[PDB]
Enzyme design. Structure first.
Site, mmCIF file in Angstrom:
data_model
loop_
_atom_site.group_PDB
_atom_site.id
_atom_site.type_symbol
_atom_site.label_atom_id
_atom_site.label_comp_id
_atom_site.label_asym_id
_atom_site.label_seq_id
_atom_site.Cartn_x
_atom_site.Cartn_y
_atom_site.Cartn_z
ATOM 1 N N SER A 1 -25.788 -45.611 4.554
ATOM 2 C CA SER A 1 -27.046 -44.931 4.813
ATOM 3 C C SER A 1 -27.747 -45.421 6.096
ATOM 4 C CB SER A 1 -27.981 -45.010 3.590
ATOM 5 O OG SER A 1 -28.485 -46.318 3.392
ATOM 6 N N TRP B 1 -26.899 -45.915 -14.561
ATOM 7 C CA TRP B 1 -28.181 -45.473 -13.996
ATOM 8 C C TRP B 1 -28.551 -44.102 -14.558
ATOM 9 C CZ3 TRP B 1 -27.892 -47.512 -8.166
ATOM 10 C CH2 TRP B 1 -27.903 -48.930 -8.205
ATOM 11 N N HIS C 1 -33.428 -55.623 3.568
ATOM 12 C CA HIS C 1 -34.805 -55.491 3.087
ATOM 13 C C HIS C 1 -35.818 -56.115 4.069
ATOM 14 C CE1 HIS C 1 -33.093 -54.014 -0.657
ATOM 15 N NE2 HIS C 1 -32.319 -55.084 -0.693
HETATM 16 N N1 LIG Z 1 -23.723 -46.039 0.374
HETATM 17 C C1 LIG Z 1 -25.066 -46.450 -0.093
HETATM 18 C C2 LIG Z 1 -24.955 -47.799 -0.787
HETATM 19 C C3 LIG Z 1 -26.237 -48.162 -1.544
HETATM 20 S S1 LIG Z 1 -25.771 -49.336 -2.830
HETATM 21 C C4 LIG Z 1 -26.017 -46.738 1.048
HETATM 22 O O1 LIG Z 1 -25.529 -47.078 2.238
HETATM 23 O O2 LIG Z 1 -27.221 -46.735 0.886
#
Ligand SMILES: N[C@@H](CCS)C(=O)O
Ligand SMILES: [Zn+2]
EC number: 2.1.1.14
Length: 753
Positions: free
Chosen positions: A439, A567, A693
């Site tokens: 992402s 989830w 983060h």
């Molecule tokens: N492919 C997802 C993993 C989140 S655990 C991302 O890059 O956000």
């Protein structure tokens, strides 16, 4: 007359009022006065709701502004010095500990609450910790009992008990050798005092939660229940109902069979089979609270089966000594099914959310007390019967395809070392290949266009064009930074589980089925209602587009079967295992479509793969590790040898091996020895190099340092270079420099080999 009992009610509000008001307080739109006024209104509202349903035993102290375990830490003075330095009121100290403090304290560690989807704030203790009753702010359990009382609602306060409170805690930075449970003598007088105050206020019973009884406990810990409860129980405190949930207490039966408490609660939804033995250790006078309405799932209870369980308890201990209860707190279920506006009425008839479960414990209670509730029973029987006969629950094609599951279906054509040969030939990746996890951060024009697309205001083609521009940007970004194995950024994706659930048969969704995950962050999980299958391609278009604009290899990006299961709200009529295998078969067709379309590097994200670990060691645990891994292998095992399968995690070494992925990523940025676990293990590994983060940028030299550390315990031939996780939550300038530095770090090593 058999009473009904609710172990706790979710507090977020029927319209998420808690989230809005707490976020408005944190942002500065709202005063703390408004914050507390709004909590008061929620509490009152939920109390009247339970009284009106006819629940006899109604909780208090179940409310929280952030986390109930954290509330106990505030109340008992388990407050590290670092949090007091800022002229903060108690409620802002609470929020400090809970969410950190922008002058920069990190939040205390958030930890998963057993195998629930809730997270608590870890009690943190020092050698210097001085336990006592902080009466400064008010005493929340006493104050909330008195509030409910002034409404004419007698409640049963809920507190986490001393053994579990300590055992679930951790020694602070400064006291690494302190064993939390060794503090039992310091904290006991403080519990005693609180209980005295609650009795004085008019509390006749207290629900004292000791869920660590469902875990594997050292003998030395098991002896502490007798010590704790011999000290707490007496004439000047409420009666105590020792409460357990989520698991089997039987192995620890010796620890509680001679305790002076007024009664016990057990979870007969997760473990109905423990009833005979736990019932047998009840003394004369002790009550048995029978947990028969599930606090963690959304299915309408089978009143005939639940009543039978309760009736087995009545047989063993007598009707006067039995209570019909929720299995756990309803913290883990959404607030109200009546808010749902889109679900078809056939499916909604199979559900009960928190508000409805109030009605269920009351009807079940009336039923075994001998009141006439035949109309309710028959209405319930019909709902259950409609669900078990529905074609939705039983898909013949899926049932047959399950019969093909065997170890051959969960094995690749050849083992890694042969596969590596063919992958080297085909991709020719450099040493220290660089990748990312999937992402990248999204634009305003994205969300607006989604909304427009949902309203039919732009066509399918117009929206596709906007997504592809985003993908285009992201790919060009990555090229120019010199990344080796690229991703498309996932701009089309809202959520890594819902995105898939929406495209699979067997799922349903809610408009309002929100559950608290931690603090003010809430999830609205998908529901698995029936047999899962995939009707068509889910991710192919976007991946084909991303690959069509670069000559670098492009990762397909899927969420694995176990994460999707864990989830979601699972079905309660079939096993976790069967649900995961059906999900794995469905994902195998998607992997097949990707590979067929030229997307021959594929990542399967399994961040929650361990979250279902059974709470005790034994058969169920080892079966789980086996089927979780099998369900991943069923998804990934039909590809050609030259197709590069990646997995992402964020964790048992040997479980990871059993997945047999060509390449792994693992959240990391921490002892070296852990890495020495994989030294003679051939498949390749990328240990996450930076915390996504944080907005902070590590230097090139920083990265070089971090790599050289790992390299002392793990060969260069297997090492991938990547961040801990996706970059969806970060800003573009943090992203640019960080990834630049990461990759030029990598190239510096590449050059000296
Ligand atoms: N492919 C997802 C993993 C989140 S655990 C991302 O890059 O956000
Ligand atoms: Zn991740």
């Amino acid at each position: 007359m058999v009473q009904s009992s609710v172990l706790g009610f979710p507090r977020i509000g029927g319209q998420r009022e808690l989230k809005k008001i707490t976020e408005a307080y944190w942002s500065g739109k709202a005063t703390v006065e408004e914050l507390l006024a709004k909590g008061k209104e929620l509490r009152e509202h939920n109390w009247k709701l339970q009284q009106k349903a006819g629940v006899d035993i109604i909780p208090s102290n179940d409310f929280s502004y952030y986390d109930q375990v954290l509330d106990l830490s505030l109340l008992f003075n388990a407050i590290p010095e670092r949090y007091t330095k800022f002229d903060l009121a108690p409620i802002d100290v609470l929020f400090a500990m809970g969410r950190g403090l922008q002058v920069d304290v990190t939040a205390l560690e958030m930890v998963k609450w057993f195998d629930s989807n809730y997270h608590y704030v870890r009690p943190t203790f020092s050698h210097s910790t001085e336990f006592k009753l902080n009466t400064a702010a008010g005493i929340k359990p006493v104050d909330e009992f008195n509030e409910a009382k002034a409404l004419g609602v007698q409640t049963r306060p809920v507190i986490l008990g001393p053994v579990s409170y300590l055992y679930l805690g951790k020694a602070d930075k400064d006291s690494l050798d302190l064993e939390p449970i060794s503090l039992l003598p310091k904290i006991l007088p403080v519990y005693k005092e609180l209980l005295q105050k609650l009795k004085e206020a008019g509390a006749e019973q207290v629900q004292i939660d000791e869920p660590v009884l469902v875990l594997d406990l050292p003998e030395a810990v098991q002896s502490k229940f007798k010590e704790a409860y011999d000290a707490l129980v007496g004439a000047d405190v409420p009666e105590l109902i020792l409460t357990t949930y989520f698991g089997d207490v039987r192995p620890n039966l010796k620890a509680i069979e001679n305790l002076p408490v007024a009664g016990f609660h057990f979870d007969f939804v997760r473990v109905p089979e423990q009833l005979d033995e736990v019932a047998s250790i009840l003394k004369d006078g002790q009550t048995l609270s029978a947990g028969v309405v599930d606090g963690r799932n959304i299915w309408k209870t089978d009143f005939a089966k639940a009543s039978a369980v309760v009736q087995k308890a009545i047989e063993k201990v007598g009707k006067d000594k039995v209570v019909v209860a929720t299995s756990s707190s309803l913290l883990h279920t959404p607030v109200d099914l009546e808010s749902e506006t889109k679900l078809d009425a056939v499916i909604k008839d199979w559900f009960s959310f928190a508000t409805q479960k109030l009605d269920e414990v009351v009807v079940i209670a009336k039923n075994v007390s001998g009141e006439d509730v035949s109309k309710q029973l028959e209405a319930n029987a019909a709902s259950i019967k409609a669900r078990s006969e529905s074609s939705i629950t039983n898909d013949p094609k899926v049932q047959e395809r399950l019969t093909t599951i065997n170890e051959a279906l969960a094995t690749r054509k050849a083992a890694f070392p042969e596969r590596l040969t063919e992958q080297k030939a085909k991709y020719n990746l450099p040493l220290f290949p660089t990748t990312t996890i999937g992402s990248f951060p999204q634009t305003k024009d994205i969300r607006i266009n989604r909304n427009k697309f949902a309203k039919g205001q732009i066509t399918a083609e117009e929206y596709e064009a906007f997504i592809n521009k985003e993908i285009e940007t992201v790919v060009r970004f990555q090229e120019e930074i010199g990344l080796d194995v690229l991703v498309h950024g996932e701009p089309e994706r809202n959520d890594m589980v819902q995105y898939f659930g929406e495209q699979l048969n067997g799922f349903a969704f809610t408009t309002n089925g929100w559950v608290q995950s931690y603090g003010s962050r809430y999830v609205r999980p998908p529901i698995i209602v029936g047999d899962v299958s995939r009707p068509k391609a889910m991710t192919v278009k976007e991946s084909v587009y991303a690959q069509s604009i670069t000559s670098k290899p492009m990762k397909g990006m899927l969420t694995g079967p176990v994460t999707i299961l864990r989830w979601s709200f699972p079905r309660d009529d079939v096993s976790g295992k069967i649900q995961a295998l059906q999900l794995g078969l469905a994902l195998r067709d998607e992997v097949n479509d990707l590979e067929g379309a030229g997307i021959t590097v594929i990542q399967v994200d399994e961040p929650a793969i361990r979250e279902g670990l059974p709470l005790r060691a034994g058969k169920e645990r080892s079966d789980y590790l086996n089927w979780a891994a099998q369900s991943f292998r069923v998804a990934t095992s039909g590809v050609e040898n030259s197709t590069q399968i990646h997995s992402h995690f964020c964790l048992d070494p040997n479980h990871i091996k059993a997945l047999d992925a060509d390449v792994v990523s693992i959240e990391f940025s921490d002892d070296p020895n852990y890495i020495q676990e994989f030294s003679e293990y051939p498949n390749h590994i990328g240990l996450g190099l930076f915390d996504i983060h944080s907005p902070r940028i590590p230097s090139k030299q920083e990265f070089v340092s971090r790599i050289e550390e790992i390299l002392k315990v793990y060969p260069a031939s297997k090492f991938w270079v990547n961040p801990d996780c996706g970059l969806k939550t970060r800003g573009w300038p943090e992203v640019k420099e960080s990834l630049t530095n990461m990759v030029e770090a990598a190239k510096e090593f590449r050059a000296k080999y």
